[PDB]
Nucleic acid binder design. Structure first.
Length: 160
DNA sequence: TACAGATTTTATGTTTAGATCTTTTATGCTTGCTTTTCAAA
């Protein structure tokens, strides 16, 4: 288990290797590098911080693919347990929640949230009406128009 | 204007809501010594 190993040694090359197996953009990868570098002397297990950083960035960058396909959300963490050498998935989401405290309110995290238009899993135009307590907020008990359209196209493909 | 009746004026008592100051006690800061877990060899 890579999350158990205390005071371990790592370089930026391993960080780029982890960030290139998730196909993140390069600026986000160097911001992950800088975020590890400004905390590197004070982590009991730096792989905990790195795991939370890449998981929180890969939730944000592919928010549209996660919206149109939830199984990607069941893929990515299921892939990353293969890289942290852990069988249970609870420590990975614990890493996500523990790192989430340390980067919320940071300027680059907020700019990433703005430019991908992703604030805790939804766009601004939905979160403003859930914050206002609107009765007309787009609740999710039906399916969206894009999901309905791609499902209708897929079922018309498999009909003939 | 005459006068009964209503309202005001002046005068005081009853009860509650709150302000200020005094006395005693809690509380936090400082400084010097002692124990204890965790980062590193």
């Amino acid at each position: 288990s890579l999350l158990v190993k205390k005071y371990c040694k790592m370089t930026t090359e391993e960080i780029i290797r982890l960030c290139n197996d998730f196909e993140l953009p390069r600026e986000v990868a160097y911001k992950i590098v800088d975020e590890y570098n400004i905390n590197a002397s004070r982590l009991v297990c730096p792989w905990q911080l790195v795991c939370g950083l890449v998981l929180n960035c890969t939730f944000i960058v592919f928010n549209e693919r996660r919206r149109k396909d939830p199984r990607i959300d069941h893929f990515i963490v299921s892939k990353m347990c293969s890289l942290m050498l852990t069988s249970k998935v609870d420590d990975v989401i614990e890493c996500v929640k523990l790192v989430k405290e340390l980067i919320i309110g940071e300027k680059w995290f907020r700019d990433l949230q703005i430019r991908y238009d992703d604030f805790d899993g939804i766009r601004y135009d939905e979160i403003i009406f859930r914050k206002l307590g609107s009765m007309l907020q787009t609740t999710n008990i039906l399916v969206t128009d894009d999901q309905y359209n791609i499902w209708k196209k897929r079922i018309e493909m498999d009909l003939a």
